[PDB]
Structure formats: C-alpha cells, structure tokens
Amino acid sequence: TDTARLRAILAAHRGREGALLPILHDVQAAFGFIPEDAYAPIAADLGLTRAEVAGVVGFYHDFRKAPAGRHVIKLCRAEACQAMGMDAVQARLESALGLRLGDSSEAVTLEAVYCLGLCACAPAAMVDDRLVGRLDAAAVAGIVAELG
Amino acid sequence: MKIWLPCDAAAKACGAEAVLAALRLEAEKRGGALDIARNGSRGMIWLEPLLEVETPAGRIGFGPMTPADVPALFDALESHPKALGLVEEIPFFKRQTRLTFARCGRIEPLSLAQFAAAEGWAGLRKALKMTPAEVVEEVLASGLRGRGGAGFPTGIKWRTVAAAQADQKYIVCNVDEGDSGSFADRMLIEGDPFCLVEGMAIAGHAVGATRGYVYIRSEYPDAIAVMRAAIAMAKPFLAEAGFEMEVRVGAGAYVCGEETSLLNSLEGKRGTVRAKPPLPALKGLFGKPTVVNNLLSLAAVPWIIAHGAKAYESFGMDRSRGTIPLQIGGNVKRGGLFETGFGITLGELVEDICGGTASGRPVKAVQVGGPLGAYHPVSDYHLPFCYEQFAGQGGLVGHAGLVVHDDTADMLKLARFAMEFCAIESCGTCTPCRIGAVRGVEVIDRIAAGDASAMPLLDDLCQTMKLGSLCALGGFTPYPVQSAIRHFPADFP
Numbered sequence: 001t002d003t004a005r006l007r008a009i010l011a012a013h014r015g016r017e018g019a020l021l022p023i024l025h026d027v028q029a030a031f032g033f034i035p036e037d038a039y040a041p042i043a044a045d046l047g048l049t050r051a052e053v054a055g056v057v058g059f060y061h062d063f064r065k066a067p068a069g070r071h072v073i074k075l076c077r078a079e080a081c082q083a084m085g086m087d088a089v090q091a092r093l094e095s096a097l098g099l100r101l102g103d104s105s106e107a108v109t110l111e112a113v114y115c116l117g118l119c120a121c122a123p124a125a126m127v128d129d130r131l132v133g134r135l136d137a138a139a140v141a142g143i144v145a146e147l148g
Numbered sequence: 149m150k151i152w153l154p155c156d157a158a159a160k161a162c163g164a165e166a167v168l169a170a171l172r173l174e175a176e177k178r179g180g181a182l183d184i185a186r187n188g189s190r191g192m193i194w195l196e197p198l199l200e201v202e203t204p205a206g207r208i209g210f211g212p213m214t215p216a217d218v219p220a221l222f223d224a225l226e227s228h229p230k231a232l233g234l235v236e237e238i239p240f241f242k243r244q245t246r247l248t249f250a251r252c253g254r255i256e257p258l259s260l261a262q263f264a265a266a267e268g269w270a271g272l273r274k275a276l277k278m279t280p281a282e283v284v285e286e287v288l289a290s291g292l293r294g295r296g297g298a299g300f301p302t303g304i305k306w307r308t309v310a311a312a313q314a315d316q317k318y319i320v321c322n323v324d325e326g327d328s329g330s331f332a333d334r335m336l337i338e339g340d341p342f343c344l345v346e347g348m349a350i351a352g353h354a355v356g357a358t359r360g361y362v363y364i365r366s367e368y369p370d371a372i373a374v375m376r377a378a379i380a381m382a383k384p385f386l387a388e389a390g391f392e393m394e395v396r397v398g399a400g401a402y403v404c405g406e407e408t409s410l411l412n413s414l415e416g417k418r419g420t421v422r423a424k425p426p427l428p429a430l431k432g433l434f435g436k437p438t439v440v441n442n443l444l445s446l447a448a449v450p451w452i453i454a455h456g457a458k459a460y461e462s463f464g465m466d467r468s469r470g471t472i473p474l475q476i477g478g479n480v481k482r483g484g485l486f487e488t489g490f491g492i493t494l495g496e497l498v499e500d501i502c503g504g505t506a507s508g509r510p511v512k513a514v515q516v517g518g519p520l521g522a523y524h525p526v527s528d529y530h531l532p533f534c535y536e537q538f539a540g541q542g543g544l545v546g547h548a549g550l551v552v553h554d555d556t557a558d559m560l561k562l563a564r565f566a567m568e569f570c571a572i573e574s575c576g577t578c579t580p581c582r583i584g585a586v587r588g589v590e591v592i593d594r595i596a597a598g599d600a601s602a603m604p605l606l607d608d609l610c611q612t613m614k615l616g617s618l619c620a621l622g623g624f625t626p627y628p629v630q631s632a633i634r635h636f637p638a639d640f641p
C-alpha cells in the first residue's frame with residue numbers, strides 16, 4: 001500500500017521544476033521518514049540516481065531517517081531563547097521525561113530547532129505542532145501533563 | 149462590540165487561542181455580539197495577546213490577556229486592570245515612521261477588501277501601465293538596498309537581469325531568516341501577506357519574468373500556510389500581470405539563506421554553496437537569469453513605485469535611505485518591532501524605548517545581526533544604526549536583529565555556541581567551516597581550562613576563517629568570538 005501512496009505523491013508533483021524537495025516533504029508527511037525503500041522510485045520518476053536522493057535526504061535535517069515518538073518537542077537553543085533562560089527549562093523537561101537533548105524514544109522525542117520566530121517570547125518550543133512561549137519552569141508542568 | 153484577537157504565532161504561543169475560547173465561553177454565558185477578528189501583530193510582543201476593541205475614538209488595546217482575566221470584560225472596559233487605551237497612541241508605536249509595516253496589524257491579513265481599502269493593489273495596477281524600464285529606473289532612483297546582507301542596489305540587479313537574454317527568467321524571495329532576533333519577515337507574511345505578492349508581481353513585470361518563487365523555512369509553518377492562502381487568493385490579481393508564483397518550503401538548513409545554496413535547493417539538489425565566477429543574475433535557477441531578493445526589499449517596491457521614489461529617498465541617512473525595522477528580542481522588557489528611519493542609537497532603542505530587561509538587571513551585551521554579528525556593550529550606545537558605521541565599527545547590521553543579555557550571562561558560553569552553530573549549520577563544502585568550527589569549539593574549551601597557547605591560536609583560526617571561507621557563515625562567525633573577547637575579557641581567563 002506504501003507504493004500506491006508514493007506513486008500518488010509522485011503523480012501529484014509531475015512536471016514541476018525541481019520537485020525533489022516537495023516530493024520528499026510529502027513522503028515524510030505521509031510516513032514519518034524517508035525509507036530507503038523509497039529512494040529508488042523517486043529517482044526513477046525524476047531521472048535522478050539513488051545517490052543524489054540519499055544525499056539530499058542526508059543533508060537536510062527535516063527529513064527523518066527514522067521515525068519519532070508519539071509526541072515531539074522542539075526546543076530553541078538559539079541566542080534569544082538562551083538569554084531568557086532556556087537552559088533551566090531544558091533541564092527540567094529532560095528531567096521530567098528523563099530524555100536528554102537529541103535523545104528520542106517510542107514515547108517522545110526531544111530535539112532542537114534553533115529558532116521559531118518567537119524571539120521576544122524568548123523561551124519557545126514546538127510541542128506536537130503547537131507553539132509555546134514564555135516557558136518558565138512552571139508551564140513545563142503543563143507541557144508534560146498533556147504529554148506522557 | 150468588535151474584537152481583534154491576533155492570529156500571529158507570537159500570540160498563539162502565549163495562549164491567544166485560549167483567550168479566544170474564554171471569550172466565546174463568556175459570550176455564550178453572557179449574551180453579546182461577539183464579533184471577532186483575527187488580525188496580525190501590531191508589533192508589541194510584550195502584550196501580544198491584546199484584545200483591541202473598537203470605539204468611536206479608535207481601538208482600545210488591552211494587555212497580555214490571559215483567559216482568566218477575560219471575565220473582567222463585558223462589565224467595564226474603563227476599570228480594567230490591563231487597560232492601555234488607544235493602541236496607536238502608545239509611545240512605542242507613535243515614535244515609529246512605520247512605512248513598510250504600515251498596514252500590518254490593523255487588518256485581517258486574508259481580507260482583500262481591507263487590503264484594497266488600505267491602498268492595496270495600487271503599485272501593481274500602476275506598474276503595468278508603466279514600462280519594464282521606467283519601473284526599473286524608478287526603483288533605481290531610490291537605490292533601495294540589499295536588506296538581507298551588506299546591501300547591494302537592487303536597481304542594478306534588476307538592470308543586469310533585464311539586460312540578459314533567455315526564454316525564461318526567474319524571481320526569488322529569500323525569506324529564510326534563520327537568524328536570531330530576526331522575525332520581521334514572519335510578521336510581514338503572517339500579517340499583510342499581499343504586499344509580498346504585490347512586490348513580486350511588480351518585480352516580475354519589471355525584470356521580464358513570468359515564474360516566481362518564495363522560500364519559506366520549516367520553522368515558520370503558520371506563515372507558510374498564510375502565504376499559500378495568499379497566493380491562492382490573489383490569482384485573479386496575479387493573472388492581470390501574467391505572473392504565477394509558488395511557495396517552497398525549506399528543510400532546516402541555515403546555509404540555504406545564501407542565494408546560491410537557496411537556488412540549489414530549489415533545483416532539487418543539496419544546499420551546497422556555489423563559487424561565484426557566474427552570478428545568479430547571469431546564471432541562477434536552472435541556468436537561467438534570476439533575480440534573488442529579500443522580503444523587505446520586495447515589500448518596499450510597490451510602496452516605492454506607487455508613492456514615488458523621491459519620497460522613499462527622503463527617509464534615512466546619506467547612503468542608507470528608507471525606513472528599517474528593528475527587531476528586539478531576548479531579555480528585554482518591551483520587545484517586538486520598531487520601524488523607523490536610520491540614525492537612531494541602540495542606546496535609545498534599548499534603554500529608553502524598550503525600557504531595560506525582563507529580569508530588571510542591566511544589560512551587558514547587545515547582539516546586532518544574528519550569530520554572525522558582534523556583541524556590542526553599553527559603551528557603544530553612541531552608535532547610530534546604519535550599514536556603514538556598524539560595518540566600520542567592528543560589527544554588522546543585516547536583518548537588523550537585536551537580542552539582549554544581562555549580567556547573568558557568560559560570554560564564554562555564547563562564544564562557544566557561535567562556533568557550535570557554525571558547526572551544526574554548515575554545508576560542509578569548504579574546509580574552514582567544516583573543521584575550523586569544530587576545532588574552535590575545542591580551542592574555546594581549552595581556553596576555559598586556562599591554556600595560553602589557545603588565544604593566539606584562536607585568533608589565527610578566526611583570521612583564516614574570515615579570509616578563506618567561502619560564505620559568510622564561516623567568515624562572520626569570528627566576529628562574535630573576537631567581540632566577546634575584546635569587549636568582555638573578564639569572562640575569558
């Protein structure tokens with residue numbers, strides 16, 4: 001059934017100019033990562049080589065090589081968010097979940113994003129497609145509460 | 149009574165949606181009109197969940213509205229604790245020239261009616277009557293600038309592209325502000341999207357293109373959605389110009405902010421920076437001539453050509469002309485955005501305008517530009533904003549980013565984070581950013597230990613990175629370091 005979805009995706013991006021990125025985006029959105037089982041057909045459709053595809057996949061960060069937990073937590077580690085106390089937040093959260101930075105699981109996945117546009121609302125995060133700001137050491141409780 | 153609850157990420161983050169819920173709840177419990185709008189951000193983030201209510205006098209703004217404070221409404225708008233009065237009368241707003249962001253936070257972004265009533269689609273409808281060359285010279289007269297970098301006259305670029313033969317030219321907007329403190333683009337494409345559509349349409353009519361692209365990051369999803377809706381809504385207004393624009397999402401790579409890497413990423417390839425024997429203007433996207441620009445540079449185009457170049461030529465300094473937005477974030481009381489003419493000091497912008505710090509502590513550092521920018525201390529408060537003086541006074545002003553750090557900061561940690569960034573964000577094409585970075589991050593540790601065979605080593609490294617590196621990310625990276633070291637020696641043993 002995966003092949004069907006993939007074919008659909010490829011058909012949807014037919015004739016476009018430089019359609020590798022969109023196609024990969026969609027492939028990821030579908031499954032959750034770029035399986036090596038799907039490096040070839042992409043190439044076959046686009047006239048590329050498995051290698052080029054894998055290289056593109058490897059370069060960019062937003063293309064998962066392996067799936068994530070049921071929940072995902074991106075936590076800015078940039079300048080501004082650092083300024084208004086991101087370290088402490090990070091510590092509290094990774095103590096709560098027991099998962100350090102970059103370390104994933106079947107349950108959750110904590111990672112970094114390096115900005116979100118919430119540079120005034122300095123301590124910022126993205127939890128499961130929901131943005132959060134002004135993350136003091138209290139809101140983390142609510143963050144974890146809705147998130148086991 | 150009319151309600152204007154922001155739809156910006158700066159609002160949804162702080163719980164604007166919860167406020168929406170609470171309002172609707174109360175109205176359901178307390179029979180009322182309950183007329184809600186979903187405008188963008190005015191630019192004052194310290195109270196972003198602001199519930200602007202209509203009155204014959206104007207629009208009265210409220211503070212950082214929490215859902216628990218909503219009950220305070222529907223009873224008395226005068227005796228409210230978080231009552232601000234006319235939002236337009238706030239000194240943080242009054243002192244702004246505010247040209248480019250003029251119609252940002254006072255309209256529903258996806259409302260063509262309001263946009264049109266807000267002088268919308270004027271420049272576009274004006275340009276088509278003009279010629280491809282007249283418009284170009286109009287844009288050139290102002291000599292607007294490069295906003296996302298050092299600053300190159302866009303007019304010259306347009307000219308170069310126009311004077312270059314091919315079946316299909318291209319136009320690209322590089323909204324990939326992966327920088328810190330830089331969030332103006334987000335506000336502009338989340339609120340007042342149509343200006344971008346307009347500017348690109350104009351620029352495409354001008355240059356001689358039909359196909360256009362816009363590069364959004366993946367860390368700006370709501371903005372992506374908005375721009376998609378915009379491009380999808382303005383199809384009638386777009387066909388008039390013979391212009392078809394598309395959005396392209398990035399994939400989490402800072403370096404893709406560079407023009408070459410950007411258009412390499414558009415092409416379906418991996419974002420490795422190209423050397424510059426040929427320029428993208430000559431040979432860019434798919435070997436074709438392409439005009440690549442920042443959002444702010446394309447947001448001024450319509451306003452320019454419409455309201456007259458000479459007017460735009462009025463604001464600013466001798467070299468730097470026109471208004472600029474100053475984004476102010478980090479540890480700072482009144483953050484957000486401040487659009488004004490150049491010549492203003494960061495002294496004023498950081499101590500007078502934006503108060504002080506959230507923690508109440510003093511400021512030890514102020515980082516203009518992104519992490520490719522220096523750490524100016526308080527002593528540099530006598531330093532007005534402009535490309536020239538800041539480039540000459542050992543620094544940088546690009547997207548006018550501005551963060552703040554108080555006395556509880558460790559410059560060592562930051563200087564380290566700089567190289568750590570240049571390390572994690574790196575195409576991996578040239579050696580001085582591949583290795584130089586991940587080595588500097590060890591050198592700084594050695595310094596933290598106390599070694600003395602490191603500082604000169606560090607300096608030499610910084611120097612070779614400056615002079616040798618291909619892009620800026622490994623050429624500007626040294627500035628943070630050297631700045632933190634020469635300005636704040638009391639933290640580097």
Ligand SMILES: NC(=O)C1=CN([C@@H]2O[C@H](COP(=O)(O)OP(=O)(O)OC[C@H]3O[C@@H](n4cnc5c(N)ncnc54)[C@H](O)[C@@H]3O)[C@@H](O)[C@H]2O)C=CC1
Nearest residue numbers: 297298300305308407429614615616617618619620623624
């Ligand atoms: N060793 C180092 O430290 C290096 C640092 N940098 C710096 O990075 C900053 C900005 O980065 P970029 O945008 O990559 O370069 P840039 O600022 O030199 O170019 C500005 C924009 O205008 C266009 N342009 C340049 N010359 C043109 C011409 N003759 N005709 C038409 N269009 C032209 C370019 O395509 C680019 O989009 C610059 O100040 C540059 O000095 C860039 C290269 C290496």
Ligand SMILES: Cc1cc2nc3c(=O)[nH]c(=O)nc-3n(C[C@H](O)[C@H](O)[C@H](O)COP(=O)(O)O)c2cc1C
Nearest residue numbers: 294295296297322324325405406407441442445620
């Ligand atoms: C590492 C790096 C990141 C950049 N990021 C951006 C960006 O987010 N937005 C931008 O407009 N220019 C960015 N630039 C500058 C581009 O090279 C180019 O100058 C700009 O996109 C052209 O827009 P202008 O003509 O309005 O300056 C970046 C450059 C480098 C080296």
Ligand code: SF4
Nearest residue numbers: 575577578581619622
């Ligand atoms: S400095 Fe060199 S290796 Fe590093 S990002 Fe720039 S071009 Fe790539």
Ligand code: FES
Nearest residue numbers: 076078081118119
């Ligand atoms: S720096 Fe984390 S929000 Fe932009």
